[PDB]
UniProtKB/TrEMBL annotation, chains A, B:
Keywords of this entry: Methyltransferase, S-adenosyl-L-methionine, Transferase
GO molecular function, one term: O-methyltransferase activity
Biological process, per Gene Ontology: methylation
Domain O-methyltransferase C-terminal: 111-297
Gene3D superfamilies, A to Z: Vaccinia Virus protein VP39, Winged helix-like DNA-binding domain superfamily/Winged helix DNA-binding domain
Matching Pfam families: Methyltransf_2
Full protein name: Methyltransferase
SUPFAM superfamilies tied to this protein: S-adenosyl-L-methionine-dependent methyltransferases, Winged helix' DNA-binding domain
Amino acid sequence: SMLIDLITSYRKTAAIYTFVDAGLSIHFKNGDYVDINKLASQYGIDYSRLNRLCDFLIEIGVLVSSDHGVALSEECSALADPNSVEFLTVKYEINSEHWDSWLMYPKSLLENNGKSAFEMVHGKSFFEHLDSNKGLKSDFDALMSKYTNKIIKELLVIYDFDKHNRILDLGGGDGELLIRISEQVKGKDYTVLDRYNEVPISEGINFIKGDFFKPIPTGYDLYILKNVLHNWPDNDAISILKNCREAMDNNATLLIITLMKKPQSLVVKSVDILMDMLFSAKQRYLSEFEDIANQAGLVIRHYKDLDEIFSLIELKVK
Amino acid sequence: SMLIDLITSYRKTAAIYTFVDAGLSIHFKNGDYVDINKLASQYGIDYSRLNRLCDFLIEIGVLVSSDHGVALSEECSALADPNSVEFLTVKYEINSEHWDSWLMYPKSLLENNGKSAFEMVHGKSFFEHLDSNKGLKSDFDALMSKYTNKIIKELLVIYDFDKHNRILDLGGGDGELLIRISEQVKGKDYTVLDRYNEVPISEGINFIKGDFFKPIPTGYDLYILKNVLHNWPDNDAISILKNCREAMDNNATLLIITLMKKPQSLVVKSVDILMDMLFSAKQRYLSEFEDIANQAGLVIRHYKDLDEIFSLIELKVK
Ligand SMILES: Nc1ncnc2c1ncn2[C@@H]1O[C@H](CSCC[C@H](N)C(=O)O)[C@@H](O)[C@H]1O
Ligand SMILES: Nc1ncnc2c1ncn2[C@@H]1O[C@H](CSCC[C@H](N)C(=O)O)[C@@H](O)[C@H]1O
Ligand SMILES: [Cl-]
Ligand code: NI
């Protein structure tokens, strides 16, 4: 049955998580079939239990069985290396932080206390929690780093960075975007602004410890907000764009790179509900961006799709 | 692709859970279309948030959209009535008890101790927790009644209960199996043995406050163990069957009704890993049942499958 499958489909996610979290996933690199006995004994885990878990992973199409042993299906090869979008999603997402928050999401809808489902559980914010927990922030950074590297090739084609002198990335985190821009485009002043417990280091990249809810520095002709605004409700989103405009002069460009909400994109709509749970935020239509931008005294001069999911909005002062 | 869908598919479970847990699902009976803005108004929920959630539920095929409003898809109609196996699965399974314990499952593999993933999280056994938490036990027993009611018709056809005078249901919970058999087969001594805080009341049904790890009462010509042995590891399972044998005389019959482990079945494999997580237990093959029954000094006289998941095993002391 369709419905009962959807309800019990969480057990599949769990089974894949446990396989990864236990570190078993590494040993199935490049379609190498494996003997379970050695793996069970290697990790000091009961063979019977591991054999049964594999048997379940074989039925959902994660693994394949033979006389030689057990291998990852070509479709699920990504679980092998630990620096993959599928692997890094499991490491970042499948934890108490999301799963305990998901169980509080219904309570957060019924109770109209402004606080989000995550905040309800943890008593803090998402990003306030990541400052306390180093382990999860390294997983968060690593996953975000992958989503930037999908965009780079197209981003450099459709936008001219050669014409800019001083580039500031607001909520840049690692500064992966600017590091990857700096490889291709040299002889520019690159600055990353984000909440730092400790300042990152990279060749030719400046790192500012700042809060974009406070006044933004002047002198930069390029301001960037990549995957920031979908973490903030309208009132908080407008505040960020208001501080951006005041900092901007009439020749300055503001780049917004985000997941664009579309009628068909289930991928975006699943993240849209995820953003409501974590931050009481949302993914936005082109109209919703024009609304918050208009209130901030900014005007959309260029819109273009980078990817199936990611898009680029080019704003200016007016 | 497949892999990323499997990893993020848990978000679909969460969405359906929130729709049910918030008590919205009840207003979608008889394929009736409902207004989102009035639903939002009734439970004091924000229309924007509810509309976006409904948007996600429409995309996964739970809901259908119209000018009239939104309705549950014909395949997901079951979310309407609170007495559906799908609804009761959400109420029983989608909670901290399973999800927080699923996150510990990889720890409980890597550790080759006697404690299950649930025991590590809660510090108690699963059934010890249900004694403390009254709300979940009512939902647990409610789901169990449904799996009981799917089997009764074929169970009464294939097994003659009229030949037995005194029947004892070991771990019968609420006497749903004995209540449903007492309807069609009348004028018999029906007795249910289980861990009760307070004893249930049903006409013609007796309820003993007992532990099947202690010596089982003698003089019953039928003993039943329906969905009990899959909650226990071999050493504990053998102990229950040893107690049954000691209680049984040469004319006595033991009925085992269970989810039989079959080679190609995803439904049973998923429950098999769930049983390991909760109780460090498993679903068993016919050979595995014979093995623990042999060590328990019991002999399999009859085996028959009642449906696609549930089977029946008659055991006799010989
Ligand atoms: N008040 C604040 N000021 C600056 N940065 C902030 C902030 N609150 C959150 N952030 C940062 O905003 C970012 C949101 S997600 C960032 C992803 C990154 N730009 C990328 O695509 O690679 C995080 O780095 C978070 O730490
Ligand atoms: N030591 C023990 N002695 C007796 N019953 C026990 C027990 N430990 C657990 N149980 C009971 O075993 C049952 C497990 S599930 C059985 C449900 C029931 N046979 C049905 O299918 O409708 C629960 O009712 C639980 O309370
Ligand atoms: Cl069983
Ligand atoms: Ni038969």
